[PDB]
């Protein structure tokens, strides 16, 4: 349809829009007209991204600022998925307007998930084709080539062909995802990553993750091209304090540090040889180290530094090198004995958990390191490897860590712990230490994101409360709300199950993980639900191991042999490529009619971004609260800083993390109001957490089913799915769910 | 093609339409 | 506002009746009728059990099907055993079928059910058909599961290719590829996939399957068909039938090859020709010239007469108008009389009576 908002006519792909969807496009106009920041909640049943994607687009191509727009998601099938319902967008539009408007969307990511050379994208590794991608790009290989033609080094044909054509014409106007793209990429010879990152810049709309826009190692580059003006989305946010925190987080290991002993000799010999053979390669950098240059104005646009800056660009001095570590052979003293310090500090019997400046007060006590020359530690690096030739990094690759690790603990002091743990696994025969360095405010990766643009929107399908998101990441909102979906029938039936059917309670806890009367009602619940669902069934377990263990008991007993029976079996392995596999057996077992059952972790790689709708997802077993490792030192560590600084509770917290996975593996069960299912909870715990559910859970939720037995959960199902399985009354939606074009006119007019 | 074909939202498409033919049965038969 | 809320309820089913129109619709049939035979029919929730309510049902509808289709065919298949087993031949005669059900009724339900088994020998038995019939599989599923030895969607095309239409009537809950076929089987329409709620409910989609299903506008199989109206014959002495070789004191004569047969409708032995009754066709000419919905009058205007005009009875005097009228003649009807002329005649008296 195309309807009108108070001044922005907005073109929706449908025939049909929800009332939810109109509601959350004033609602977003609204934030956008007033400015300022704000949280939306939509439920998981009703179409979120055609209708952001709609009325931004509509309001760039309306309003004469043009704001680009920002799209950032967590994970890249989402960028995909949100990249085909913007191509099916462009069509509409491009049907309805008569032309094809000047628009160009692109998708961004890694050069493992874009590139085409026959013999470098068959790594198992990103880094590998990162490292293998800068040998065939850097330039050195292009210079070499050109001084002499007898070089035997070789160049990458779909990046050579780039320069013949201008960045205007990399490719046609529209939208391009990923799939599209390689296609065109491949017919052509040319390389899609180096397309999107020389077109960032100029495309309407950009569609990335959130390690793109937080992370400071590859966010600073993409960020330095978007323009200040443009709307930010940040789709499916609730689960952004963990991307927050594990930007700014190391672990280093005693491996670790034995390796880099070993890189520090290699580069002490390089510069050994080049000083004997080539000597003028090191006074030139010496001499440009004097000024005050730094890496942006030593290194080409064309190269990048060897170590990724791992501070936010704000904390990065302005000031020339120290001098310390200006020579080359004072710079690989200073680190090596860096290095020494470390390995000598990994010795303790016992957690140790200590403040940045007293680690770096103990650093200039111990031996002469101080604050101002370990911060240029990653750029003095990345400047002498730089230098030095080092086409073969292989040796080089362990300092990275350590120079990460240094410019990090000398740049930030508050907000962050470093553990020392004799025991990385406390299940060993022998001690393994490590050494964490943690971030425990979430805040500080995202201010500059809040601070840098004007109107942000976080919107989601499962983020409540929203009254602790502003707490956590410190900053606030014009409106922060929820949308209660206008079901005229119940489609999806929320229960929670606290005890088997023999009446005893049943809980996830840890330690009582193997226990035969807790494992067999599992057991039991998991066969009746299997017996009862037509097609599909996910089960999430609150930890890989738990669900290792308990499939293992559940082996043993035979239950899984009754499973067999009625379904297949698809197992959540470490291994992503394995998993993908697994769900792509899944989804054809449920759509041929065989019928599947598919067991993953509420935390792991299928709960962020693989959604479960109609065929696919009938019902869905939360084995337990997805609780955290209470006894894990970061964890605590956390839970401590946000009780003193932002006054939360360590169980609020504890129980909010929890109910939030719940709740992210709930929603990934609707994608319309035709669609249902079954969301049982199967731990006692729940009974008490529905106030901390989603709104359109919690209504949904009865006061008969929060505390429920398997027998009588199974009947409820049965009575459910049957109720379900009988055609709609058009009437009963024709106006109350489903609007047409004359009814939302009428809503309106009402309203006005 | 097959992506966008699974990512649409059918529920919010235009109902489906019978497209079953009518006939009009005409009656005039001469006597025996 | 108990007796208004009935009323309102006559009116809301009186609704749907309104809505009627002369669709085209296939008389010639030939069905295949596949029962499930599994584990999952063991259950209970149907006393005494799915396999007995399932096999009396069927029986039914046979009795149904045959009554209102004379001049249809029905085979009949089962699964049992991840297998298709056939059990009826595609014919002519009820009694056959009626035999080979009351023969099933022993035989313990057990195994996986296979729908791409079904699906295969139901197409190997609907090939032999003419083009001017048309070709319906009426499944009866009750498992969750589908154990298949092959690819399911190979054959869903194939049925589309052939122009067979399914219609599956399940027991506890939908199933994905049940709702793929019966919609990409019928152009799209996702109507003739049914989940029964109780034993009633199930009689009413029994019964409901037994009308002609409309045709589609694009699919013609327009063509003119050589049938033959034999005359009875009767004799002092039996004679040899030509299609069971056994005694029968008299039979039909065809027209075409004078060889006798017991019973009709049937293709005569000899000369396949069909042969069958004047009145095989007049029972299929009110699903040609179906009889027009009545409304019922308000009670605001005057009525015409005290008494039914086609059973001369006093209507009751109470709110609401116990009355129904047709529109092509304009004479009032009771109610008790309204479902007997819409159910049973097809004919209204008062536009007979009505001269021109
Ligand atoms: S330039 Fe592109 S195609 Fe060539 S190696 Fe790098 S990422 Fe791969
Ligand atoms: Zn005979
Ligand atoms: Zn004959
Ligand atoms: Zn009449
Ligand atoms: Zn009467």
């Not at chain 1, 401590?640 to 992210?664: G, K, P, T, V």
């Not at chain 3, 099907?65 to 249809?72: A, H, L, R």
């Not at chain 3, 019966?182 to 709620?197: H, P, Q």
């Amino acid at each position: 349809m195309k309807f009108y908002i108070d001044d922005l006519p907005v073109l929706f792909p449908y025939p049909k829009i929800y009332p939810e969807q109109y509601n959350y496009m004033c609602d977003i106009k609204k934030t956008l007209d007033v400015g300022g920041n704000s949280i939306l909640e939509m439920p998981s049943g009703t179409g979120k991204t055609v209708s952001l994607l709609s009325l931004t687009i509509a309001y760039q191509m309306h309003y004469p600022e043009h704001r680009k727009i920002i799209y950032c998601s967590r994970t890249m099938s989402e960028i995909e998925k949100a990249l085909v319902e913007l191509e099916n967008l462009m069509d509409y539009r491009t049907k309805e307007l008569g032309y094809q408007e000047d628009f160009r969307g692109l998708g961004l990511t890694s050069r493992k998930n874009l590139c085409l050379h026959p013999e470098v994208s068959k790594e198992r590794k990103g880094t590998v084709v990162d490292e293998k991608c800068r040998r065939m790009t850097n330039g050195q290989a292009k210079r070499k080539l050109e001084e002499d033609p007898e070089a035997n080094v070789e160049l990458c044909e779909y990046h050579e062909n780039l320069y013949n054509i201008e960045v205007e014409d990399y490719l046609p106007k529209g939208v391009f995802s990923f799939e599209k793209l390689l296609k065109y990429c491949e017919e052509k010879t040319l390389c899609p990553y180096f397309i999107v990152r020389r077109m960032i810049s100029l495309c309407n709309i950009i569609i990335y993750s959130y390690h793109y826009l937080l992370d400071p190692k590859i966010a600073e580059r993409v960020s330095n091209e978007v323009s200040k003006d443009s709307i930010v989305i940040f789709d499916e946010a609730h689960n952004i304090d963990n991307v927050c925190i594990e930007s700014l987080s190391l672990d280093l290991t005693t491996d670790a540090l034995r390796r880099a002993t070993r890189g520090a000799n290699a580069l002490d010999e390089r510069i050994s040889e080049v000083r004997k053979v080539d000597s003028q390669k090191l006074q030139d950098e010496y001499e440009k180290l004097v000024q005050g240059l730094h890496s942006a104005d030593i290194l080409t646009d064309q190269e990048e530094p060897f170590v990724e800056t791992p501070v936010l660009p704000q904390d990065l001095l302005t000031e020339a090198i120290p001098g310390n570590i200006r020579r080359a052979e004072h710079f690989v003293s200073f680190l090596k004995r860096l290095i020494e310090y470390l390995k000598t500090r990994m010795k303790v019997l016992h957690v140790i958990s200590e403040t940045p400046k007293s680690f770096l007060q103990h650093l200039k006590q111990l031996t002469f390191i101080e604050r101002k020359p370990l911060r240029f530690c990653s750029e003095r690096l990345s400047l002498l490897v730089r230098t030095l030739e080092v086409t073969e990094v292989e040796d080089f690759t362990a300092l990275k860590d350590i120079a990460t690790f240094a410019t990090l603990i000398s740049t930030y002091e508050e907000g962050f712990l470093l553990i020392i743990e004799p025991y990385e696994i406390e299940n060993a025969a022998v001690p393994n230490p490590i050494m964490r360095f943690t971030c425990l405010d979430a805040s500080i990766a995202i201010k500059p994101v809040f601070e840098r643009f004007s109107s942000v929107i976080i919107t989601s399908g499962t983020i409540s409360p929203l009254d602790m998101y502003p707490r956590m990441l410190n900053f606030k909102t014009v409106l922060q709300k929820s949308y209660a979906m206008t079901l005229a029938k119940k489609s999806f039936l929320p229960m929670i199950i606290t005890k088997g059917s023999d009446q005893v309670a049943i809980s996830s806890r840890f330690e009582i993980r193997n226990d035969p009367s807790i494992v067999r009602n599992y057991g039991s619940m998991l066969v009746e639900f299997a017996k009862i669902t037509p097609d599909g069934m996910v089960v999430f377990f609150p930890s890989y191991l738990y669900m290792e263990s308990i499939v293992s008991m559940w082996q043993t007993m035979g239950i899984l042999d009754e499973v067999w029976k009625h379904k297949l079996i698809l197992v959540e392995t470490p291994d992503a490529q394995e998993t993908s596999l697994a769900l792509e057996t899944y989804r054809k077992a449920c759509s041929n009619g065989r019928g599947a059952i598919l067991l993953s972790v509420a935390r792991g790689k299928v709960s962020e971004g693989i959604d479960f709708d109609h065929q696919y997802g009938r019902t869905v077993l939360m084995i337990g609260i997805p609780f955290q490792y209470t006894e894990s030192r970061i964890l605590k560590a956390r839970l401590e800083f946000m009780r003193e600084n932002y006054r939360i509770r360590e169980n609020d917290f504890l129980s909010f993390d929890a109910m939030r996975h719940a709740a992210q593996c709930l929603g990934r069960v609707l994608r319309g109001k035709d669609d249902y299912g079954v969301m049982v909870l199967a731990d006692r715990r729940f009974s008490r957490k529905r106030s901390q559910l989603p709104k359109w859970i919690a209504q949904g939720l009865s006061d008969a089913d929060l505390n429920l037995s398997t027998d009588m959960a199974i009947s409820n199902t049965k009575q459910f799915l049957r109720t379900m399985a009988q055609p709609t009354d058009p009437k009963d939606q024709e106006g109350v769910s489903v609007w047409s074009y004359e009814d939302l006119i009428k809503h309106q007019n009402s309203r006005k | 093609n097959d992506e966008r074909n699974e990512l649409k939202i059918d529920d919010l498409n235009e109902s489906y339409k019978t497209n079953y033919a009518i006939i009009h049965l005409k009656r005039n038969a001469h006597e025996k | 506002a108990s007796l208004v809320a009935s009323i309102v309820e006559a009116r809301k089913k009186r609704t749907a009746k309104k809505n009627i129109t002369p669709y085209q619709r296939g008389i010639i049939r030939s069905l295949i009728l596949t029962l499930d035979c599994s584990e999952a029919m063991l259950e209970k929730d149907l006393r005494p059990n799915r396999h007995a309510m399932i096999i009396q049902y069927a029986i039914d509808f046979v009795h149904e099907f045959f009554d209102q289709n004379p001049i249809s065919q029905m085979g009949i298949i089962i699964m049992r055993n991840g297998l298709a087993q056939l059990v009826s031949q595609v014919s002519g005669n009820p009694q056959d079928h009626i035999d080979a059900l009351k023969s099933i009724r022993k035989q313990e339900p057990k195994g996986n059910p296979s729908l791409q088994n079904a699906l295969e020998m139901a197409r190997g038995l609907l090939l032999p058909v003419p083009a001017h019939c048309t070709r319906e599989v009426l499944i009866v599923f009750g498992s969750l599961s589908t154990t298949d030895p092959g690819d399911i969607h190979q054959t869903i095309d194939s049925l589309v290719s052939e122009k067979i239409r399914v219609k599956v009537l399940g027991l506890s809950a939908q199933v994905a590829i049940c709702k793929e076929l019966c919609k990409a089987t019928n152009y799209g329409d996702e109507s003739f996939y049914k989940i029964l709620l109780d034993e009633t409910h199930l009689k009413e989609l029994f019964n409901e399957a037994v009308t002609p299903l409309p045709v589609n506008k694009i699919n013609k199989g327009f063509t003119l068909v050589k049938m033959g109206f034999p005359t009875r014959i009767f004799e002092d002495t039996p004679t040899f039938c030509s299609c069971h070789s056994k005694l029968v004191y008299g039979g039909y004569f065809c027209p075409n090859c004078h060889s006798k047969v017991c019973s009709l409708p049937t293709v005569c032995p000899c000369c396949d020709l069909m042969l069958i009754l004047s009145t095989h066709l007049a029972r299929s000419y009110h699903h040609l010239m179906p009889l027009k919905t009545f409304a019922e009058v308000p009670t605001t205007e005057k009525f015409r007469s005290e008494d039914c005009f086609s059973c001369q009875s006093r209507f009751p005097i109470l709110l609401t108008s116990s009355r129904y009228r047709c529109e092509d003649c304009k004479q009032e009807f009771c109610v008790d009389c309204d479902v007997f002329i819409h159910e049973i005649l097809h004919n209204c008296p008062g536009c007979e009576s009505k001269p021109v």
